[PDB]
Structure 1
Amino acid sequence: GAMNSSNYAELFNNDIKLFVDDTNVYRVTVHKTFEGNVATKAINGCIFTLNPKTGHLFLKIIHTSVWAGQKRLSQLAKWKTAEEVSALVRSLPKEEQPKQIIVTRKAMLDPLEVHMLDFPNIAIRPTELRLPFSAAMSIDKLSDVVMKATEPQMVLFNIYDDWLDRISSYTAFSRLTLLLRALKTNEESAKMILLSDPTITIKSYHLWPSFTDEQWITIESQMRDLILTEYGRKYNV
């Protein structure tokens, strides 16, 4: 069934599962033509496939060549997503394949179910949570590898850096969702918060700065402030 607040700790048990977010697969800029009509120009996208227990991120880069000569691209993008997720699962050893795949948008349910007919024991699930994974392209190193790609490519990351050495996966997911929620509500402010201090650096093999435990508490508090704030500047409260 659907994943929600009630069954939230199921994400951190020992059944392998993946979140799949398709919101950055088909990306366009809208512009005017010389004749004054409107047209789209596609830019590179990505599938965001994430193990919430381990932090392993399978980032499949979607190069704009995949759209050449195709019609109904928003519909195709969902099926392309399902094709790539199915290919990923088939590439994993049996003991690494997920028992469940949770899609962040319900329109991915039928495309993924059909592509996974060969895997009747893998549950395809929606969610009632409004997760902020669309903001993945606000993470500078992820955006950089997507925009530089000249061909289809899969790149592997750990979106938790080394956090699991010090915190649990429940706590790591909560920090991730807070950071991504902030970047989604006000990207400039969020990024200022994260980088304001030039003495805290991002290691070459990491995505986020190397905050101490105490500095993470300060950071997380500032992100909460921002989200409520902008929730003020938005609704005037």
Structure 2
Amino acid sequence: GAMNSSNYAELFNNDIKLFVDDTNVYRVTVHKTFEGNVATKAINGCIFTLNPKTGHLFLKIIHTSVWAGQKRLSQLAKWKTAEEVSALVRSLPKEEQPKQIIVTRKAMLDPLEVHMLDFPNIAIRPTELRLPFSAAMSIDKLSDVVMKATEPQMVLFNIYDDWLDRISSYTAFSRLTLLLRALKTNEESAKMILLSDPTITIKSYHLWPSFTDEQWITIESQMRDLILTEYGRKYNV
């Protein structure tokens, strides 16, 4: 069924699973028209499909041309997501296909279920977790590749960089969600924390800086303070 605080560790067992987040598939900027009306201009988007055990991130870039001449784009966006996830599964060898796909928003359940009718044995599941995957666009290297795309394109990343050499996927996922939660709550301050120290750099083949174990503890603390902070500024506590 649904994924929540009680069955949280199933994410890190050895059954292949993918999270799918569609919150950055259809993106627009709202602006005024010369006649003083309002219109949208779409910009490039992405499907965020993540294996939480391995860190493998299948970033499918949604180029604005896919919306051209289409109606009801927020609804099409869910079906286009489901179409691309299904295409990805079909493209993978059988032993790499997921056993479960967990969607971060319940509106994706029916579109994905319909596009995956050919895989009756893949469980399509919702979650009650409020995961911060919408902030994936705050990771500079991911935002850059999406905005520069001139055509539909799939790009593969490992969102954990080399962390799994030193920590478990449970701890790596916990770090990732804390980073993304901070970037979603105060992007400016979050990025300030991550880059305040010019001596720590981001390797060309990584997304995040090359923190030592001890420096990650400092960073993780600073991110928690930020989230508590913004929580006070928001609610006046």
TM range (shorter): over 0.9
How far did residue 71 of structure 1 move? 0.1
How far did residue 81 of structure 1 move? 0.1
Cα separation, 2, equivalents of 1:25 and 1:144: 15
Cα separation, 2, equivalents of 1:223 and 1:5: 22
- Given the two structures, how large is their TM-score scaled by the length of structure 1? 1.00
How far did residue 212 of structure 1 move? 0.1
* Residues 131-184 of structure 1, C-alpha deviations (whole Å, 9 max, x = no match): 000000000000000000000000000000000000000000000000000000
Q: Percent identity?
A: 100
Cα separation, 1, equivalents of 2:74 and 2:38: 17
* Residues 2-31 of structure 1, C-alpha deviations (whole Å, 9 max, x = no match): 000000000000000000000000000000
How far did residue 188 of structure 1 move? 0.2
Cα separation, 2, equivalents of 1:225 and 1:34: 45
Cα separation, 2, equivalents of 1:67 and 1:187: 28
Secondary structure of 1:19's aligned partner? strand
**Which residue of structure 2 lines up, in the alignment, with residue 61 of structure 1?**
61
Q: Please, which runs of 5 or more residues in structure 1 have no aligned partner?
A: none
How far did residue 109 of structure 1 move? 0.1
* Residues 26-71 of structure 1, C-alpha deviations (whole Å, 9 max, x = no match): 0000000000000000000000000000000000000000000000
Secondary structure of 2:19's aligned partner? strand
Task: Tell me the C-alpha RMSD between the 2 structures.
Answer: 0.2
Secondary structure of 2:54's aligned partner? coil
Cα separation, 1, equivalents of 2:30 and 2:217: 40
Cα separation, 2, equivalents of 1:222 and 1:68: 43
- Given the two structures, how large is their TM-score scaled by the length of structure 2? 1.00
Cα separation, 1, equivalents of 2:219 and 2:32: 41
Cα separation, 2, equivalents of 1:5 and 1:195: 32
Q: Please, which runs of 5 or more residues in structure 2 have no aligned partner?
A: none
Cα separation, 2, equivalents of 1:3 and 1:156: 25
Cα separation, 1, equivalents of 2:58 and 2:146: 13
Cα separation, 1, equivalents of 2:136 and 2:189: 16
Count, aligned residues: 237
The list of structure 1 runs, each at least 4 consecutive aligned residues, that deviate by more than 4 angstroms after superposition, is none
Cα separation, 1, equivalents of 2:137 and 2:180: 10
Cα separation, 1, equivalents of 2:137 and 2:217: 24
Cα separation, 1, equivalents of 2:67 and 2:59: 18
* Residues 92-138 of structure 1, C-alpha deviations (whole Å, 9 max, x = no match): 00000000000000000000000000000000000000000000000
